[PDB]
Amino acid sequence: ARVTVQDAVEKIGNRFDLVLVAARRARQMQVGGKDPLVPEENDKTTVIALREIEEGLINNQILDVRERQEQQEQEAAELQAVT
Amino acid sequence: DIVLNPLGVPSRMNIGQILETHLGMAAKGIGDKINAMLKQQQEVAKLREFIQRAYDLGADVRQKVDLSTFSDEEVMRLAENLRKGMPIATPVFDGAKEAEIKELLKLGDLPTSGQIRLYDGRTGEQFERPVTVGYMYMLKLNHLVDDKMHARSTGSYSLVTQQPLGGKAQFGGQRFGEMEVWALEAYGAAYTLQEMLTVKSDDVNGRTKMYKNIVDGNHQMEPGMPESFNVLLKEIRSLGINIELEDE
Amino acid sequence: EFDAIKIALASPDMIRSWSFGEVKKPETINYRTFKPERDGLFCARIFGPVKDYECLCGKYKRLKHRGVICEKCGVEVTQTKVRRERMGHIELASPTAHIWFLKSLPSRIGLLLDMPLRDIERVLYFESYVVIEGGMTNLERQQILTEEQYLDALEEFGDEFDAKMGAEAIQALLKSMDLEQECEQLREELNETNSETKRKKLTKRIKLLEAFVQSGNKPEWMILTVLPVLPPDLRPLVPLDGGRFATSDLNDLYRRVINRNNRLKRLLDLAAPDIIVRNEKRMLQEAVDALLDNGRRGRAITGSNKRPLKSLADMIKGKQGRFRQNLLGKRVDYSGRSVITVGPYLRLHQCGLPKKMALELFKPFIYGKLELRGLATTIKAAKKMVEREEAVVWDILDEVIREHPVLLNRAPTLHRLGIQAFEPVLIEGKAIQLHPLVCAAYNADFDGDQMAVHVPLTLEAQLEARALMMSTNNILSPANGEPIIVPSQDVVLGLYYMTRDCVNAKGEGMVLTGPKEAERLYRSGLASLHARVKVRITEYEKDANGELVAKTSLKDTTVGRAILWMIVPKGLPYSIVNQALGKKAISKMLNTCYRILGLKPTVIFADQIMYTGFAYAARSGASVGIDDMVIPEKKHEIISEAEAEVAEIQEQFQSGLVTAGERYNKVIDIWAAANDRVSKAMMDNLQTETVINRDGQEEKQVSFNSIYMMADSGARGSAAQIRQLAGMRGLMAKPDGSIIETPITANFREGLNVLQYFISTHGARKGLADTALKTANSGYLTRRLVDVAQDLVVTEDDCGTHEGIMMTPVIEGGDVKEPLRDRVLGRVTAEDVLKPGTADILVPRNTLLHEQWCDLLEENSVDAVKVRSVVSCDTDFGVCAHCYGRDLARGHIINKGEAIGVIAAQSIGEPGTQLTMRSSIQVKNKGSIKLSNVKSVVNSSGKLVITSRNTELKLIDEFGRTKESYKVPYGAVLAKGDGEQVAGGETVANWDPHTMPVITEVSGFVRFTDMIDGQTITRQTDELTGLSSLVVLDSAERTAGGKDLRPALKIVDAQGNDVLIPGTDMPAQYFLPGKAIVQLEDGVQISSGDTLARIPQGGLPRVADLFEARRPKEPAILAEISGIVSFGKETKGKRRLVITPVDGSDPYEEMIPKWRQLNVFEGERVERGDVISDGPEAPHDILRLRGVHAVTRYIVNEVQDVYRLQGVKINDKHIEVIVRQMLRKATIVNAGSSDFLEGEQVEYSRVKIANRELEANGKVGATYSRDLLGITKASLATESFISAASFQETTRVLTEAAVAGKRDELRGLKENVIVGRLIPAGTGYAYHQDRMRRR
Amino acid sequence: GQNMRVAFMPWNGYNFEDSILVSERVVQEDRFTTIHIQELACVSRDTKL
Amino acid sequence: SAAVKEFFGSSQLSQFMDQNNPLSEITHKRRISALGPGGLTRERAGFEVRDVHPTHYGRVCPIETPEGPNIGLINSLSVYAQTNEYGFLETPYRKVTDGVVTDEIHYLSAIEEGNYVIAQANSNLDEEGHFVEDLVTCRSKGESSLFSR
DNA sequence: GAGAAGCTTTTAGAATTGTGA
DNA sequence: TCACAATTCTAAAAGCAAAAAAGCCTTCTC
RNA sequence: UAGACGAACGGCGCGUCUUUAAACCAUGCGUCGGGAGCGCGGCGGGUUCAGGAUGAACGGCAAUGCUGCUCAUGGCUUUUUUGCU
Ligand SMILES: [Mg+2]
Ligand SMILES: [Zn+2]
Ligand SMILES: [Zn+2]
């Protein structure tokens, strides 16, 4: 549950970067099938993403490096299967 | 029966409603005494004496109602009509006076202050500060909430500009005017604004795709460019002007 | 997909290339079957199929046929939406002139040819002739002939004479003219103009020609030969109920023009005579001109009943054109309305949404969940299940609502708090339940208002609603710092009744262990809610960094204050609960809570405050009765006294000892005094009425009268209302504004009688009309501010600058209107603040002056600061986060991206609905004295007399922070000296108002230099005194012979050797004007300070005019250079006046009228920014002469005056940014090594960046003078035409852009709003920066 | 209209700004019930086919 | 037929009856409007026409006019107001002869109201119709003031 | 009948011309 | 010549919503 | 009752006639329907030329058909009144 996003804002000090980061993570959860990194409490994907940002384990850097890593492992699976 | 707010009296200087409340309380007190007499079945002597006392108080007032001429049969009819409260006529700029109101209150067994003691309905506790109770004439204006409510998910759209129709009569959407557009620009609400400008009003393929996405548990829009802008482009090319969208 | 919009003129070949076929017949449809008909305005052969994937005749229908053009009928089987995109054309038999490029004023065909407008107008409409190619004859080309002269020329000149008529002649002229040779020749001739009026004309014409040859246009494209036709589906012939048809008006106009074209083709085919073909060409011209813009020619043709029928320009123009109706604002799906009620149980991030509206707005989400759960396989089954409103749909609906926000909106969205996001709670009913606290933000009461609710669909819109627009984020206003979640009226009444004290209440003077025991005592009944008590209260100071220390002690309080102490969070003190807690006190409580603790405590605290205030307002039982309006017991005595005095004055007038006006003023003043006495008696009786005892004699305390507590808590009402209820309601003005003599001595507790009520009705009707007709003026002003400032965004962190405005406390001359603590709160210092001791860095030079730093400044008592200002920012195309400063709605520095022009315009405009629409220096306090710009000498009396027109004084405290300022004109009798100390109330100076002294720095005898007894002077002895003197006269009455003999006087010594001006070696010749009555004749040794020659003498529209930058009708003429000034020649039109500098040259001379009491004599100096004649001043002069800081400070002060007189509070950032957006152009003086013309007016950022990069090498830059435009001109004269055309003057803007061949890269907010993409301001800043990074 | 019994006091914020707090006894007695008569026209036309 | 039907059916001053109350009907019938064909307009109306003139007294109500745009132009006609043979509003007064206040009713128009001193309705009368107190509040030339008996 | 043939706002800015030197 | 100034033509004048009614060229047939 | 015709074909409708293709209308009556690409030809429509109102050729398109290869199967304007700012 979320009433205020000030704790989430304090760890991304723009308040317009928060919207885009949380949108990326929430779209991942909703469509990408990714598993939430925090327990679900009958929250929606947007609130779950904002809670994750509040905890301090999602931001632009973490998302970028995770995307790079998973793309690299999928490519590595291709490479192992083919060579 | 009804509870109003005292704060509407000082700023909105309508003292007439408090005076109406007091005089209505007095009238209903007279009617309550008449009902008490007319219930514990009495004789017409006491009723005519009391109604005469009620009709013959005040300063030197125009009307003289004498019940010695009423033949004792329509005095009971009059009392039956008066058991709901004695009607009172208070002409516009020569009406009653607070002394007359206090005298009429004292005719009944009401307090002259106009304010009685009340108790809380759900805690049984006396409110402090005696409150002004009385009878006020309430009107029901013809602005009913079941004629004002209206909502729409989707419907039909105009021909020339593929936008929702406007009105409750022809099922239609709300105008998101330019002042609301400014207020959204004053936040950082760029995506809300884009969706309200394209996928909820004009962009036809975008809004069909948005519907199909929503029903499929996916919340994402295809931007597109509004059809009203194309209508404007054609309306401007129909002059000699040649307005064109440059390359990528 | 695209980056810009290019506007230009359409060639006939280009129009033919847009076309799909050429329209020939006026007819539209058949009326047997409503299918189209060939070569009509609706034609399947031209404009595409009627039905999808079908041929009109019916031959081609298969999927294998998509594309084939049928041979039977010629239609192309394809989508019918193609009707919405295909244009035709009409081949006009004769060329025709486009109305816009002819009659736009300026005329783009007029000045291009240099011909005047009316001659071309006569030529086009076949009323006269025009020659071309004069040849070897004495007739030039562009001159105009007429019928008789044409006949004469033709008979006397052979075939080699081309004289044509109508648009064909205009086209021939336009095509024969070569552009390059004319441009070069006229540019060459321009250099020898000598700077007369004609120069301006030339710099217009050239600006056309070059701008008309740089782009790929030719002149003859302003004359129509082929005419496009709008696609059929944009001018539809919809059927209706019956056999008729609801046609559009464009169809009628096209039918008319096609009719006339066909007739003209017929006549030209059958070799008609000249008269009839002339008439028909004229009529076709009129038809086309009606089609393109119906009404610019003679009276607009009327369609059917009485209404001029719409043309294309009408469909583009106006408040109901495409721009303002369908692109800048739309109708939207997923939206609803209803009436609003109050829900006092909600938390302030919630609203109550009816179940019916919720189910109607969230249908697709419900379908999604239904198909997800499997409760309905196909979509139609889910649709029908929802239509039957089953028992499972409601749990789904409660699951598609949990954390999904909705936007609530009230009709006039004056500022950005008229839209807010809430988390719906489903409610059984039909009205939306709105939280009580957010009602102030909306300006919504609950007497019938409605509210519109919108649903955000996409995921980013939900995040934006949850993060930017949620009602728990918007607790502070953006117009100022102050909160907007202050409790309104019942909460404050409850907290004022609860936190109060009675001098002897039940259970007084016992000792308690804490708030909890106080509450138990009160609830159980053993004590009164406000009885004085001792309570042990533990309060937590968070003085230790991130650490709370819990002080405990015994405090003398009341039971109600102890009960209220429970809500208050940890960090706050007990000094905030230990008072009466009116409205301002609660506002300060919430403010300090926010600034100390944070956000979440403030939100929870506000909710708890609302709950407890409502609860204890219910418990109090506060009512209002008739016996709570206590009349003064002494009212009739005062009224009898005042009436007797009025009768005494009336008797005084009846005997004719007084006039009318002074009787009027005596009456008005005595009645006003009586009114004030009655008011004072009423309030003194009311406020302290209650008198009560503790243990003996009666003490007295503050009144528990209901109306007193209502008007004292700040809950509702003010002293004026309590005045009108109890004391007399005073004096009323009639419609003319003349105050009626007889007041209304009756008050509303008693009755007004008929006459008094009638006067009250005068006043009431005036007020209601004023409001109802000023709402629109405020709306127009707000629109203009938004459309000038909308494209200004914060786009950098630092410009790297030191310049900034000098902010000081603002004093009109009495008490300080508002301190320095309020001005520079949240501004960034530009140049460092020095400790008042000596040259010590007190705070660094890039601090954000928050509460700590400002309090430090206050305790150290700094006089003023220099702060970074937006108008002085060197960032181009936006501002930097530091010059703007703090985000007002938030607590931190402004974020990169935020759009501050829209919020500035909204802050200035929203309070516009509260504004209206229709001696000697007596010091106040004791302190040191200072003066500046003072030129004075000692007189015989030992005082000091001043010889300057800009002299002032300050009374200053013992710390140097100024307290009082005043202004002293030329020649005042100073009562003290500089640097001394005075006493409170000590008069410091005095003057003689109506006379203008000519006091001398020197003294001696007088010389009668150059007077003729009868012309220079006319003796007029002071008959009633006895003595006589000379009376000098002006130049407007004497004869021409003595007119040049200027009447003057001079002071000399005994011997006559001229006494020279002090400081130099020249005599002091004091030249005088007329009416300069020289009382002191020769033989009188004068003294300094002696009068040589007596010289006897809005509301909201004010703001609108200040932002329009309108020059007044009596401007205070300023001075341009230093050095000795002089008079000029003897009044050729205007009295000439010359200035002479010392370092510079003296060609400068000004043409001043003869209706000004000038401030300067011949023998006196001036300076840039001096006044030559007082009066209201022009901002243009301030910008040109004094500077840019001068004009911005001037405008800020003169707007804040209006906004502070009404009790409104706006920050000074907003006016500063609107000023920045006004002064935005610049005219180049020196072309330099750049490519700018002699006097071209160019965007200031353009020349700034141009010369900035040009000075990379050693070349020279340019010189510019900034122009001050209004808000209509500053927004119309922008570089982007899409913005300007959607605002005002669509025809002018589009013609200018089209002939100029302009190109619009969007770059703005309104432009991206129209084309339906992300604005480059908020959450869309990142995407636009990304796009700019890929170029 | 109808002549109702009134008390001028605040009550738990339910008559906060201009709202009114009615009792159920006003609705049970149908003191403010009104009758509204609509009209609905079905017009059968001479259409093609 | 076309002209009379155009007047009665589709005209600015021939408007749909306001009918949900007897008061609504009766006060719609006694309604004066400064708009219409031959009158001014809502936006072209200044403020001197939007206002209560002193000669409205007894002929036009000051406190019954619709709020919003057309305030002051949709005036309502007083209880005793009437009309001359020429079309000017008039209102009834009682002749006051020789101090005694008789009961013959004269109907005065605005251009006759200015040549008399009209006493006030609630000015006290004693038996046989004298003014009990020796000086009364009146209005003589578009302005109220206090006059001898 | 059905189907065509064809008589009053107010303010303000910018462009003429109409004397005026 | 080249400058003020009276004329006059052009633009603009808040937002949102509810209900109702009247209409959607002249005319010329034979 | 059935048959035929009405810009290619089929059903249905409508109009007309009775073994016949006419008459009616004149982007030659109305509504609906054709699994697709390549290939064969070509109703219909046009280009060129001549001939002297007539005729030869033509392939960008293309109707009833034929063989073979590949594939999932829905309203706008004016007026009036009202409501909230
Ligand atoms: Mg309201
Ligand atoms: Zn076809
Ligand atoms: Zn800066």
Short mmCIF file of N, CA and C (backbone and C1' of nucleotides) in Angstrom, two decimals, chain C residues 32 35-38 44 51 56-62 64-65 68 71-73 246 307 410 412 443 445 447 449, chain H residues 7-9 25 27-37 43-45 61-64 75 77-78 83-85:
data_model
loop_
_atom_site.label_atom_id
_atom_site.label_comp_id
_atom_site.label_asym_id
_atom_site.label_seq_id
_atom_site.Cartn_x
_atom_site.Cartn_y
_atom_site.Cartn_z
N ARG C 32 -32.97 9.96 -55.74
CA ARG C 32 -33.64 8.66 -55.84
C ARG C 32 -32.92 7.63 -54.98
N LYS C 35 -26.58 7.92 -53.83
CA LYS C 35 -25.22 7.73 -54.27
C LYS C 35 -24.72 9.00 -54.96
N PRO C 36 -23.40 9.19 -55.06
CA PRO C 36 -22.87 10.39 -55.72
C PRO C 36 -23.22 10.46 -57.20
N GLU C 37 -22.78 11.52 -57.86
CA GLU C 37 -22.96 11.67 -59.30
C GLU C 37 -21.69 12.27 -59.90
N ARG C 38 -21.44 11.95 -61.17
CA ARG C 38 -20.12 12.15 -61.75
C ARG C 38 -19.73 13.62 -61.78
N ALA C 44 -17.43 9.60 -56.64
CA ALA C 44 -16.65 8.41 -56.33
C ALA C 44 -15.46 8.27 -57.26
N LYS C 51 -18.48 2.97 -50.20
CA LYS C 51 -18.45 1.81 -49.31
C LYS C 51 -17.05 1.19 -49.31
N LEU C 56 -18.61 1.35 -57.18
CA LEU C 56 -19.91 2.02 -57.13
C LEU C 56 -20.95 1.28 -57.96
N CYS C 57 -20.62 0.94 -59.20
CA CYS C 57 -21.56 0.19 -60.03
C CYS C 57 -21.83 -1.18 -59.45
N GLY C 58 -20.80 -1.85 -58.93
CA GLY C 58 -20.97 -3.10 -58.22
C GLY C 58 -20.22 -4.25 -58.87
N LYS C 59 -19.28 -3.94 -59.76
CA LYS C 59 -18.62 -5.01 -60.51
C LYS C 59 -17.52 -5.67 -59.69
N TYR C 60 -16.69 -4.88 -59.01
CA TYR C 60 -15.50 -5.38 -58.35
C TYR C 60 -15.75 -5.40 -56.85
N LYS C 61 -15.75 -6.60 -56.26
CA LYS C 61 -15.98 -6.75 -54.83
C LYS C 61 -15.06 -7.75 -54.13
N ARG C 62 -14.34 -8.60 -54.85
CA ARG C 62 -13.60 -9.68 -54.22
C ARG C 62 -12.35 -9.15 -53.52
N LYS C 64 -9.70 -10.22 -54.31
CA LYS C 64 -8.65 -10.26 -55.35
C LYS C 64 -8.70 -8.96 -56.11
N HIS C 65 -9.62 -8.09 -55.74
CA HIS C 65 -9.81 -6.87 -56.51
C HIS C 65 -9.34 -5.60 -55.81
N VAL C 68 -7.89 -2.42 -58.24
CA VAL C 68 -8.29 -2.24 -59.63
C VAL C 68 -9.23 -1.05 -59.76
N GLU C 71 -13.73 0.11 -64.97
CA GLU C 71 -13.87 0.80 -66.24
C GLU C 71 -15.29 1.30 -66.48
N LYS C 72 -16.30 0.64 -65.92
CA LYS C 72 -17.67 1.07 -66.13
C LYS C 72 -17.91 2.46 -65.56
N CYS C 73 -17.42 2.71 -64.35
CA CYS C 73 -17.67 3.95 -63.63
C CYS C 73 -16.41 4.69 -63.20
N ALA C 246 -29.01 17.62 -44.43
CA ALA C 246 -28.34 18.63 -43.63
C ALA C 246 -27.01 18.94 -44.28
N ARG C 307 -27.96 34.57 -41.48
CA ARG C 307 -26.63 34.40 -40.91
C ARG C 307 -25.60 34.33 -42.03
N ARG C 410 -12.58 20.60 -11.43
CA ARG C 410 -13.69 21.54 -11.35
C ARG C 410 -13.58 22.54 -12.49
N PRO C 412 -13.79 25.87 -13.92
CA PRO C 412 -12.69 26.78 -14.25
C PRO C 412 -11.42 26.35 -13.53
N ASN C 443 -11.65 25.69 -4.68
CA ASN C 443 -12.59 26.81 -4.52
C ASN C 443 -14.03 26.33 -4.58
N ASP C 445 -17.52 25.00 -2.85
CA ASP C 445 -18.48 24.78 -1.78
C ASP C 445 -19.42 23.66 -2.20
N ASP C 447 -22.95 23.76 -2.46
CA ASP C 447 -24.28 24.29 -2.72
C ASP C 447 -24.72 24.08 -4.16
N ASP C 449 -22.27 22.60 -6.74
CA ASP C 449 -21.16 22.50 -7.68
C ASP C 449 -21.07 21.08 -8.23
P A H 7 -28.38 -4.29 -65.99
"O5'" A H 7 -27.01 -4.00 -66.74
"C5'" A H 7 -26.93 -2.98 -67.73
"C4'" A H 7 -25.53 -2.79 -68.26
"C3'" A H 7 -24.50 -3.85 -67.88
"O3'" A H 7 -23.58 -4.02 -68.96
"C1'" A H 7 -23.74 -1.75 -67.17
P A H 8 -22.77 -5.40 -69.15
"O5'" A H 8 -22.37 -5.82 -67.66
"C5'" A H 8 -22.88 -7.01 -67.07
"C4'" A H 8 -21.89 -8.14 -67.12
"C3'" A H 8 -22.32 -9.42 -66.44
"O3'" A H 8 -23.12 -10.24 -67.28
"C1'" A H 8 -20.15 -8.85 -65.71
P C H 9 -24.44 -10.94 -66.72
"O5'" C H 9 -23.90 -11.96 -65.63
"C5'" C H 9 -23.10 -13.07 -66.00
"C4'" C H 9 -22.81 -13.97 -64.83
"C3'" C H 9 -23.99 -14.28 -63.92
"O3'" C H 9 -24.82 -15.31 -64.43
"C1'" C H 9 -22.12 -13.69 -62.60
P C H 25 -37.38 5.78 -68.78
"O5'" C H 25 -36.34 5.42 -67.63
"C5'" C H 25 -36.58 5.80 -66.28
"C4'" C H 25 -35.37 5.57 -65.42
"C3'" C H 25 -34.10 6.30 -65.85
"O3'" C H 25 -34.04 7.63 -65.38
"C1'" C H 25 -33.60 4.02 -65.50
P U H 27 -26.49 9.16 -65.39
"O5'" U H 27 -25.37 8.19 -64.81
"C5'" U H 27 -24.09 8.68 -64.44
"C4'" U H 27 -23.00 7.71 -64.81
"C3'" U H 27 -23.32 6.24 -64.53
"O3'" U H 27 -22.72 5.41 -65.52
"C1'" U H 27 -21.45 6.92 -63.23
P G H 28 -23.38 5.29 -66.98
"O5'" G H 28 -24.19 3.91 -66.97
"C5'" G H 28 -24.90 3.46 -65.82
"C4'" G H 28 -26.39 3.61 -65.98
"C3'" G H 28 -27.21 2.55 -65.25
"O3'" G H 28 -28.47 3.09 -64.84
"C1'" G H 28 -27.45 2.29 -67.62
P C H 29 -28.78 3.36 -63.28
"O5'" C H 29 -30.23 2.73 -63.05
"C5'" C H 29 -30.41 1.35 -62.79
"C4'" C H 29 -31.39 1.14 -61.65
"C3'" C H 29 -30.82 0.58 -60.36
"O3'" C H 29 -30.13 1.54 -59.59
"C1'" C H 29 -32.85 -0.51 -60.88
P G H 30 -28.98 1.08 -58.56
"O5'" G H 30 -29.78 0.36 -57.39
"C5'" G H 30 -30.58 1.11 -56.49
"C4'" G H 30 -31.12 0.24 -55.38
"C3'" G H 30 -30.10 -0.58 -54.61
"O3'" G H 30 -29.46 0.17 -53.59
"C1'" G H 30 -31.96 -1.94 -55.18
P U H 31 -28.07 -0.32 -52.96
"O5'" U H 31 -28.42 -1.70 -52.25
"C5'" U H 31 -28.97 -1.73 -50.94
"C4'" U H 31 -28.98 -3.13 -50.37
"C3'" U H 31 -27.64 -3.86 -50.39
"O3'" U H 31 -26.81 -3.52 -49.30
"C1'" U H 31 -29.33 -5.28 -51.25
P C H 32 -25.26 -3.94 -49.31
"O5'" C H 32 -25.28 -5.53 -49.34
"C5'" C H 32 -25.51 -6.28 -48.15
"C4'" C H 32 -25.57 -7.76 -48.43
"C3'" C H 32 -24.28 -8.40 -48.92
"O3'" C H 32 -23.37 -8.68 -47.88
"C1'" C H 32 -26.10 -9.16 -50.24
P G H 33 -21.80 -8.82 -48.18
"O5'" G H 33 -21.69 -10.13 -49.10
"C5'" G H 33 -21.87 -11.42 -48.55
"C4'" G H 33 -21.72 -12.50 -49.60
"C3'" G H 33 -20.37 -12.58 -50.28
"O3'" G H 33 -19.44 -13.34 -49.53
"C1'" G H 33 -22.11 -12.71 -51.90
P G H 34 -18.03 -12.71 -49.09
"O5'" G H 34 -17.19 -12.69 -50.44
"C5'" G H 34 -16.27 -13.74 -50.76
"C4'" G H 34 -16.88 -14.77 -51.68
"C3'" G H 34 -15.89 -15.44 -52.63
"O3'" G H 34 -16.30 -16.78 -52.90
"C1'" G H 34 -17.51 -14.27 -53.88
P G H 35 -15.85 -18.00 -51.94
"O5'" G H 35 -14.43 -17.56 -51.37
"C5'" G H 35 -13.25 -17.69 -52.15
"C4'" G H 35 -12.04 -17.24 -51.36
"C3'" G H 35 -10.83 -16.79 -52.15
"O3'" G H 35 -10.95 -15.48 -52.70
"C1'" G H 35 -10.13 -18.22 -50.43
P A H 36 -10.27 -15.13 -54.11
"O5'" A H 36 -8.72 -15.00 -53.77
"C5'" A H 36 -8.23 -13.88 -53.05
"C4'" A H 36 -6.77 -14.04 -52.68
"C3'" A H 36 -5.79 -14.12 -53.84
"O3'" A H 36 -5.48 -12.87 -54.42
"C1'" A H 36 -5.29 -15.81 -52.27
P G H 37 -4.99 -12.78 -55.94
"O5'" G H 37 -3.50 -13.34 -55.90
"C5'" G H 37 -2.44 -12.55 -55.37
"C4'" G H 37 -1.10 -13.21 -55.58
"C3'" G H 37 -0.75 -13.59 -57.01
"O3'" G H 37 -0.29 -12.50 -57.79
"C1'" G H 37 -0.31 -15.42 -55.60
P C H 43 -12.89 -9.42 -75.05
"O5'" C H 43 -14.32 -9.35 -74.35
"C5'" C H 43 -15.42 -10.11 -74.84
"C4'" C H 43 -16.58 -10.10 -73.89
"C3'" C H 43 -17.16 -8.73 -73.55
"O3'" C H 43 -18.08 -8.26 -74.52
"C1'" C H 43 -16.77 -9.92 -71.55
P G H 44 -18.21 -6.69 -74.83
"O5'" G H 44 -17.74 -5.98 -73.48
"C5'" G H 44 -18.68 -5.50 -72.53
"C4'" G H 44 -18.03 -4.67 -71.46
"C3'" G H 44 -17.45 -3.33 -71.90
"O3'" G H 44 -18.43 -2.32 -72.02
"C1'" G H 44 -15.90 -4.45 -70.50
P G H 45 -18.02 -0.85 -72.53
"O5'" G H 45 -17.09 -0.29 -71.37
"C5'" G H 45 -16.53 1.02 -71.46
"C4'" G H 45 -15.07 1.02 -71.07
"C3'" G H 45 -14.13 1.70 -72.05
"O3'" G H 45 -14.11 3.11 -71.89
"C1'" G H 45 -13.23 -0.39 -71.40
P C H 61 -1.70 -5.50 -66.64
"O5'" C H 61 -3.18 -5.09 -66.22
"C5'" C H 61 -3.43 -4.50 -64.95
"C4'" C H 61 -4.75 -3.77 -64.93
"C3'" C H 61 -6.00 -4.63 -64.91
"O3'" C H 61 -6.28 -5.16 -63.62
"C1'" C H 61 -6.27 -2.86 -66.46
P A H 62 -6.15 -6.74 -63.34
"O5'" A H 62 -7.52 -7.35 -63.87
"C5'" A H 62 -8.75 -7.01 -63.26
"C4'" A H 62 -9.83 -6.74 -64.28
"C3'" A H 62 -10.45 -7.97 -64.93
"O3'" A H 62 -11.50 -8.51 -64.15
"C1'" A H 62 -9.85 -6.40 -66.60
P A H 63 -11.47 -10.04 -63.67
"O5'" A H 63 -12.99 -10.50 -63.81
"C5'" A H 63 -14.04 -9.72 -63.26
"C4'" A H 63 -15.35 -10.00 -63.96
"C3'" A H 63 -15.69 -11.46 -64.18
"O3'" A H 63 -16.24 -12.08 -63.03
"C1'" A H 63 -16.03 -10.28 -66.19
P U H 64 -15.95 -13.64 -62.74
"O5'" U H 64 -16.83 -14.40 -63.83
"C5'" U H 64 -18.24 -14.42 -63.74
"C4'" U H 64 -18.85 -15.38 -64.72
"C3'" U H 64 -18.34 -16.81 -64.66
"O3'" U H 64 -18.95 -17.57 -63.64
"C1'" U H 64 -18.34 -16.08 -66.90
P G H 75 -24.16 10.68 -37.55
"O5'" G H 75 -23.36 12.03 -37.30
"C5'" G H 75 -23.22 12.58 -35.99
"C4'" G H 75 -23.39 14.08 -36.02
"C3'" G H 75 -23.15 14.80 -34.68
"O3'" G H 75 -22.54 16.07 -34.94
"C1'" G H 75 -25.29 15.30 -35.46
P U H 77 -22.19 23.48 -34.06
"O5'" U H 77 -23.23 24.48 -34.73
"C5'" U H 77 -22.86 25.26 -35.85
"C4'" U H 77 -24.03 26.05 -36.40
"C3'" U H 77 -24.69 27.02 -35.45
"O3'" U H 77 -23.98 28.24 -35.29
"C1'" U H 77 -26.35 25.77 -36.55
P U H 78 -24.05 29.04 -33.91
"O5'" U H 78 -25.52 29.64 -33.88
"C5'" U H 78 -25.92 30.60 -34.85
"C4'" U H 78 -27.39 30.93 -34.73
"C3'" U H 78 -27.87 31.37 -33.36
"O3'" U H 78 -27.58 32.73 -33.07
"C1'" U H 78 -29.35 29.75 -34.21
P G H 83 -30.32 30.07 -11.95
"O5'" G H 83 -29.23 28.94 -11.75
"C5'" G H 83 -29.60 27.68 -11.22
"C4'" G H 83 -28.46 26.70 -11.27
"C3'" G H 83 -27.12 27.22 -10.80
"O3'" G H 83 -27.02 27.30 -9.40
"C1'" G H 83 -26.84 26.00 -12.79
P C H 84 -26.27 28.53 -8.71
"O5'" C H 84 -24.75 28.08 -8.70
"C5'" C H 84 -24.38 26.76 -8.32
"C4'" C H 84 -22.96 26.47 -8.70
"C3'" C H 84 -21.96 27.58 -8.40
"O3'" C H 84 -21.55 27.57 -7.05
"C1'" C H 84 -21.60 26.72 -10.59
P U H 85 -21.08 28.94 -6.35
"O5'" U H 85 -20.20 29.65 -7.48
"C5'" U H 85 -19.04 30.39 -7.16
"C4'" U H 85 -17.89 30.00 -8.05
"C3'" U H 85 -16.90 31.10 -8.39
"O3'" U H 85 -15.93 31.31 -7.38
"C1'" U H 85 -17.52 29.96 -10.37
#
